[PDB]
Amino acid sequence: ESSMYSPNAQYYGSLHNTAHVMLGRQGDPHGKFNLPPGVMEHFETATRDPSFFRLHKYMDNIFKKHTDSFPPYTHDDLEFAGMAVDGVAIDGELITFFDEFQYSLINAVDSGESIEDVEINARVHRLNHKEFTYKITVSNSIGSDHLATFRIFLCPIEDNNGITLTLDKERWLCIELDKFFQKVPSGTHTIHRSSKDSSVTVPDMPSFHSLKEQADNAVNGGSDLDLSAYERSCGIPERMLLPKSKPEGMEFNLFVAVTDGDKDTEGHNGDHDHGGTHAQCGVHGEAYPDNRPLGYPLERRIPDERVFDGVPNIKHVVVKIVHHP
Amino acid sequence: ASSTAHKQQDINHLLDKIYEDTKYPDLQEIAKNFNPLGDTSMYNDQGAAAEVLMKELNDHRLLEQHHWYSLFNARQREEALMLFAVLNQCKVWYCFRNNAAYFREQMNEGEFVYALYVGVIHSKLGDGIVLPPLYEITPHMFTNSEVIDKAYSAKMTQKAGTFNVSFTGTKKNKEQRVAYFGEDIGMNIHHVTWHMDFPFWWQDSYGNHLDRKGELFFWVHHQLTARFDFERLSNWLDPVDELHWDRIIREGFAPLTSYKYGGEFPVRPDNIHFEDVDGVAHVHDMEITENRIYEAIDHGYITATDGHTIDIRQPKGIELLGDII
Ligand SMILES: *[C@@H]1O[C@H](CO)[C@@H](O)[C@H](O)[C@H]1NC(C)=O
Ligand SMILES: [Cl-]
Ligand SMILES: [Cu+2]
Ligand SMILES: [Cu+2]
Ligand SMILES: [Mg+2]
Ligand SMILES: [Mg+2]
Ligand SMILES: [O]
Ligand SMILES: [O]
């Protein structure tokens, strides 16, 4: 990155953070023109720049050399014995669209002495999607109810040239849609999971005006303000859960791995509140709740797809996403 | 004997199994016994073209059989046109047929096929004849090497078969998306036949003027270019760039096709600069030529050999430009 956890910054330096500055300053690399830092030199702005994603794919490939160095998972590594994913379906069509969102610009302008504010807003078009629900039918033949981790990914079927991808060529392209822990009772049952409840996403932030109104209303009148209804600001926006897709529709693989929740949460508390964004943003003030490597079970090479196909607790199905312009 | 039936049959026989000595005994007899110099009254030029060609043949100056032929090769073209010139002077079909049979057995097959085609097209004796498609007369020039090899295998094993052609390149090559345009066998016949109908070597002393040829040269190629770009637009591609003598040719090409005699067609790598071609031209010569043509366009006149102006600010100007380009 590097962080202050680095055991040897004198030798390994700070590749990623220095790269942000190297890239950000390429419009004036010698300071001759006195230009200010580039968009890459703030986390507020870095993703606006196309080169952000070229830099971060470069960095991602460094990590991938390490993750690719481990032996592929075996059947015995992956099997959650007695747990079979019988079916994966979605209740509701997968549909994206653009809608409009407003935020205040008042703090950007200069207010005089004794000059009344006027409302000044920006309106942006933003991606969004319709609500849907996963229906994951699972057969538990273990003999007792068991905690399971449900890991949900969206994977490309073909590339932009129309070439069908192998699982090994898909896995590093898959995007995480959800991760959750749920007790699966003995027998056959359908788990339902709302798109709204994804542990990858958080809702749009409340506006500054709304926070002022709610705080002021609570303070005025001796009313206990409680905002325990809102989430953290870390997390993919809920509205961006799905890729845009195409008006003609595109098909993707919806990949579901159901894994041993006891093993995954050992040393923690599996059936406890982990907040709404633990997949990539963790749990405020607590240990990370999932012991598996990030990306499990897609983070190692899969040279032989037969291994995955032979594991009853892994299943993928084809889903279609349609963009409404 | 001059009936359309017999003329068509004669042409069919002359073009059959073109890489081997004729298998038709009547054509064999003509090739053995006919004397192109034996009756000057056969010809509208009192026999001159026949004398010219027979002298080259008797002096052993003609390209051997079983050898590649290119119309763009000056000497090979000159030889093909010597045979065209004989056929073009024949007054009656038996002169045309007998000279064609005679020289079929003496001349390079590529030269012979070319001369016979343009001879039929440009002689009134050819009226009513339908020329066989060149993709069945010289299939190597229209068929990728893999399919030719299967045909060779079918012949080696004496087993009939029909083999599927499936476009050059891979799906990773975006240019393959539009291979169905330039590789279409009929599009290639369109192109060769246009040039046979309107040859750059035409002189009106051959018998007639080719009206507006230089402007039709502009137009037919403008339409090929515009039609190709419509296929690119249909396939999510941008329009083609224009070539520049001082800039890279981005898109290479592997024909995966072979001559019957001469070997495989050569590949061009992606992203290469033009190099001087020994025996043809320097790249800089192409730039100078281009500059001189643009000088005429921007002057509004072409410069004659003695320096006087040839006005092109008139409707024939585009035709005169086609003539010089
Ligand atoms: C060739 O194409 C035909 C029709 O498209 C098909 O029936 C046949 O199986 C193909 N042969 C091969 C070897 O693909
Ligand atoms: Cl149920
Ligand atoms: Cu970064
Ligand atoms: Cu042409
Ligand atoms: Mg021969
Ligand atoms: Mg030149
Ligand atoms: O970043
Ligand atoms: O970052």
Q: Which of B171, B173, B175, B235 is the best mutation test for A, with the most CBs of A within 10 A?
A: B171
- Let me know: does A200 contact A176? Beta carbons within 8 Å: yes
- Let me know: does B117 contact B131? Beta carbons within 8 Å: yes
The verdict on B135 and B225 lying in the same domain is no
Q: How far is the CA of A36 from the centre of ligand 3 (A)?
A: 19
Contacts of B171 in chain A (CB under 8 A): 161-163
Nearest to A16 by CA among A40, A39, A44: A40
- Let me know: does B243 contact B286? Beta carbons within 8 Å: no
In B74-146, where do the E strands start and end?
A: none
Burial of B154 (0-12, 13-18, 19+ CB in 10 A): middle
**How far A143 CA sits from the closest chain B CA (Å)?**
50
Spatial separation of the C-alpha atoms in residues A164 and B178, rounded to whole Å: 20
Please say whether the dihedral angle defined by the alpha carbons of residues B295, B301, B305 and B307, taken in this order, is positive or negative.
negative
Question: Least CA distance to A163: which residue of chain B?
Answer: B171
Q: Quick check: helix, strand or coil at residue A254?
A: strand
Pairing of strands A314-323, A94-104: parallel
Spatial separation of the C-alpha atoms in residues B212 and B194, rounded to whole Å: 13
The verdict on B160 and B293 lying in the same domain is no
Is B213 near chain A, with CB under 8 Å?
no
Which residues of chain A have a Cβ shorter than 8 Å from any chain B Cβ? 161-163
Neighbouring C-beta atoms of residue B138, cutoff 10 Å: 19
Structure tokens at A196: 């709204």
Q: Quick check: helix, strand or coil at residue B22?
A: coil
Q: How far is the CA of A242 from the centre of ligand 3 (A)?
A: 22
Q: How far is the CA of A205 from the centre of ligand 8 (A)?
A: 21
The verdict on B254 and B266 lying in the same domain is yes
Half-sphere exposure of A14 (CA within 13 A, CB side): 9
The verdict on B33 and B179 lying in the same domain is no
CB contact under 8 A, B172 and A163: yes
What does the angle CA B69 – CA B73 – CA B76 come to, to the nearest 5 degrees? 60
CB contact under 8 A, A162 and B172: no
Q: How many domains does chain B have?
A: 2
Q: Say which CATH number the domain at A85 has.
A: 2.60.40.1520
Residue-number span of the structural domain to which A277 is assigned: 70-99+127-204+224-325
Instruction: List, as one string, the DSSP characters of A36-92.
Output: ---GGGSTTTGGGSTHHHHHHHHHHHHHHHHHTTSPPPPHHHH--TTEEEEEEEEES
Contacts of A163 in chain B (CB under 8 A): 171-172
CA B246 to chain CA centroid, Å, is 29
Spatial separation of the C-alpha atoms in residues A250 and A200, rounded to whole Å: 22
Spatial separation of the C-alpha atoms in residues B23 and B35, rounded to whole Å: 20
Q: Tell me which long-range contacts B228-231 makes (C-beta under 8 A, separation of at least 24).
A: B228/B178, B228/B181, B228/B182, B231/B178, B231/B180, B231/B181
Is B67 near chain A, with CB under 8 Å?
no
The verdict on B105 and B249 lying in the same domain is no
Nearest to A191 by CA among A153, A241, A147: A147
- Let me know: does B18 contact B109? Beta carbons within 8 Å: yes
The verdict on B185 and B309 lying in the same domain is yes
The verdict on B1 and B121 lying in the same domain is yes
Domain boundary among B118, B140, B167: B167
Strand order in the sheet with A83-91: A83-91, A133-140, A187-194
Nearest to B43 by CA among B105, B98, B6: B98
Q: How far is the CA of B164 from the centre of ligand 1 (A)?
A: 6
What does the angle CA B239 – CA B245 – CA B247 come to, to the nearest 5 degrees? 65
Question: Least CA distance to A160: which residue of chain B?
Answer: B172
The verdict on B203 and B178 lying in the same domain is yes
Report which bound ligand comes closest to the CA of B146: 1
Q: Say which CATH number the domain at B277 has.
A: 1.10.1280.10
Domain boundary among B167, B193, B213: B167
Contacts of B174 in chain A (CB under 8 A): 161
Structure tokens at A168: 């090994």
- Let me know: does B248 contact B7? Beta carbons within 8 Å: no
Instruction: Tell me whether the omega of the peptide bond preceding residue A297 falls within 30 degrees of 0, making it cis.
Output: yes
Q: Which of A161, A169, A246 is the best mutation test for B, with the most CBs of B within 10 A?
A: A161
Is B174 near chain A, with CB under 8 Å?
yes
Helix or strand holding residue B234 (H, E): helix B213-234
The verdict on B187 and B153 lying in the same domain is no
- Let me know: does B103 contact B27? Beta carbons within 8 Å: no
Report which bound ligand comes closest to the CA of A184: 2
Residue-number span of the structural domain to which B299 is assigned: 168-325
In B258-325, where do the E strands start and end?
A: 301-303, 309-311
Spatial separation of the C-alpha atoms in residues B257 and B253, rounded to whole Å: 11
How many helices (H) and strands (E) chain A has is answered by 9, 11
Contacts of A162 in chain B (CB under 8 A): 171
Domain boundary among B133, B167, B201: B167
Is B316 near chain A, with CB under 8 Å?
no
Nearest to A26 by CA among A54, A61, A57: A54
Contacts of A161 in chain B (CB under 8 A): 171-172, 174
Spatial separation of the C-alpha atoms in residues B2 and B5, rounded to whole Å: 8
A1 is catalytic: yes
CA B161 to chain CA centroid, Å, is 30
Instruction: Tell me whether the omega of the peptide bond preceding residue B41 falls within 30 degrees of 0, making it cis.
Output: no
- Residue partners of A249: CB distance under 8 A and separation at least 6: A320, A321, A322
**How far B170 CA sits from the closest chain A CA (Å)?**
10
Spatial separation of the C-alpha atoms in residues B51 and B42, rounded to whole Å: 13
The verdict on B35 and B77 lying in the same domain is yes
CB contact under 8 A, B174 and A162: no
Q: How many angstroms separate the first and last alpha carbons of chain A?
A: 39
**How far B176 CA sits from the closest chain A CA (Å)?**
10
The verdict on B95 and B203 lying in the same domain is no
Contacts of A169 in chain B (CB under 8 A): none
Interface contacts (A, B; CB < 8 Å): 6
The verdict on B217 and B300 lying in the same domain is yes
The backbone torsions φ and ψ at residue A282, rounded to the nearest 5 degrees and listed phi first, read 65, -165
Pairing of strands A94-104, A83-91: unpaired
Spatial separation of the C-alpha atoms in residues A53 and A195, rounded to whole Å: 26
- Let me know: does B108 contact B18? Beta carbons within 8 Å: no
Helix or strand holding residue A184 (H, E): strand A175-184
